[PDB]
Design an enzyme around this catalytic site. Structure first.
Site, mmCIF file in Angstrom:
data_model
loop_
_atom_site.group_PDB
_atom_site.id
_atom_site.type_symbol
_atom_site.label_atom_id
_atom_site.label_comp_id
_atom_site.label_asym_id
_atom_site.label_seq_id
_atom_site.Cartn_x
_atom_site.Cartn_y
_atom_site.Cartn_z
ATOM 1 N N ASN A 88 -4.455 22.509 -2.877
ATOM 2 C CA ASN A 88 -5.398 21.805 -3.060
ATOM 3 C C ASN A 88 -5.662 20.448 -3.157
ATOM 4 O O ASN A 88 -6.958 19.975 -3.369
ATOM 5 C CB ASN A 88 -5.987 22.679 -4.854
ATOM 6 N N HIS A 114 -10.963 23.793 -7.523
ATOM 7 C CA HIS A 114 -12.684 24.704 -7.239
ATOM 8 C C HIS A 114 -12.918 25.209 -6.377
ATOM 9 O O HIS A 114 -12.874 24.430 -5.343
ATOM 10 C CB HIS A 114 -13.640 23.470 -7.731
#
Ligand SMILES: [Mg+2]
Ligand SMILES: [Mg+2]
Lengths: 238, 238
Positions: free
Chosen positions: A116, A84
């Site tokens: 991430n 995201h």
């Protein structure tokens, strides 16, 4: 409006702009991911409201034409997470707000273990922690597709595309954060991190770059509407 | 208005749109070249007035930010021509019209012998030749960066960047041509050619593609505002 409150210091670009409940996104029909996303945090806004991230569902933003959509199947067994850009943790004020951070327009193919889930997350946590001592905070995040010098003495941009939809795997990601420390005066921090495994021992300061380098690599005008004299600190200096 | 006359059947995109005298362009801050150009032809507009191309000069359009400009120095000794996307020979009705086609915004790094000077130009002449038997003619032209399946079973987009400004060398070029043959009835022609040396014996028809492939590859919506029933011919068929 909430969008004008977010985009106060400039739109980096005006391509396929979508205004969500709590952040703004520019979508790239070619790479099947974002050009950039922009967020505005205040210490009040970083406080949670019966809001549940477990309820969120990865899905496409169907306001974009069908042929330019990434789909969950493009990311399945690719070797990459759906990562995201506008982080879930920044948007805690309603269920719909955080739901929208799981739109696939806000996703880029990201290395999971070592990025991430690790070093990139560290950079997100840094920004929230810093956003707490500031009046206002603005963050621009987006993918980069950076050139490399190869053996033959020429430069080439090379990047993977995954899935039937050919969603691009960025070589790097940028993140520019603008923190308002006293009324009218701001600290600026610019980062470029490789979409790759980074050892947990490396400090984020090592990925500091000038704001000029992000603008050139990204093809974007970042915080264009802010007077440069109001910036009292770039990347820990001045 | 002339731009409205040119863009009658739709904008492929809205990114950094510059409307020139006689064509419309969308510039890509990242590749330092165009996303697309749009041109409109009538038999009338293919007649010359006292206008001369020898007068034109290769320069950047400084209406775009400096950091996103390509310069003549980027193309010099690079192995590539300054290939005009919007062809000078489509613009014969004034001196300013043709002068604008020599803006570097209208240029992409192209192979010379075997492409720009040779197979691409034939395609350019082909569109002009047909534009004369047609009421109206519309042309969308732009660069492509196409993925390739490699030995490891993964797909990659890979392209060279030349100059200090890192101008993208496109893998391919597209051209879509919409010919009005009778009022409200159209013949559609779509092409994708590789930015490479092509042998003069290959016919341009060999590079036909569905319009969908151009849209998907380029991330654009071409002639989107056109009734498909208005099209009576696709790439020589029906
Ligand atoms: Mg994440
Ligand atoms: Mg040419």
């Amino acid at each position: 409006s909430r969008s004008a409150e977010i985009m106060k210091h400039g739109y980096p670009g005006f391509t396929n702009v979508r205004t969500y409940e709590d952040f703004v996104l520019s979508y790239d029909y070619k790479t099947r991911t974002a050009h950039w996303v922009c967020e505005h945090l205040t210490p009040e806004r970083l406080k949670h409201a019966g809001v549940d991230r477990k309820l969120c569902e990865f899905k496409p933003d169907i306001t974009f034409p069908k042929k330019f959509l990434s789909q969950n199947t493009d990311y399945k067994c690719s070797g990459f997470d759906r990562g995201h850009l506008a982080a879930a943790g920044n948007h805690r004020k309603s269920q719909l707000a955080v739901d929208q951070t799981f739109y696939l327009s806000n996703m880029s193919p990201q290395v999971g273990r070592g990025f991430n889930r690790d070093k990139w997350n560290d950079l997100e946590m840094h920004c929230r922690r810093v956003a707490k001592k500031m009046i206002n905070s603005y963050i621009i995040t987006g993918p980069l597709y950076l050139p490399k010098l190869e053996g033959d003495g020429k430069k080439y941009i090379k990047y993977q595309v995954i899935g039937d939809n050919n969603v691009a795997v960025p070589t790097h990601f940028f993140k520019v954060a603008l923190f308002e420390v006293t009324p009218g005066k701001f600290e600026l921090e610019s980062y470029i991190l490789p979409n790759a495994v980074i050892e947990d021992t490396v400090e984020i300061s090592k990925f500091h770059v000038p704001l000029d380098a992000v603008e050139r690599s990204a093809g974007l005008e970042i915080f264009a509407r802010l007077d440069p004299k109001s910036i009292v600190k770039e990347n820990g200096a001045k």
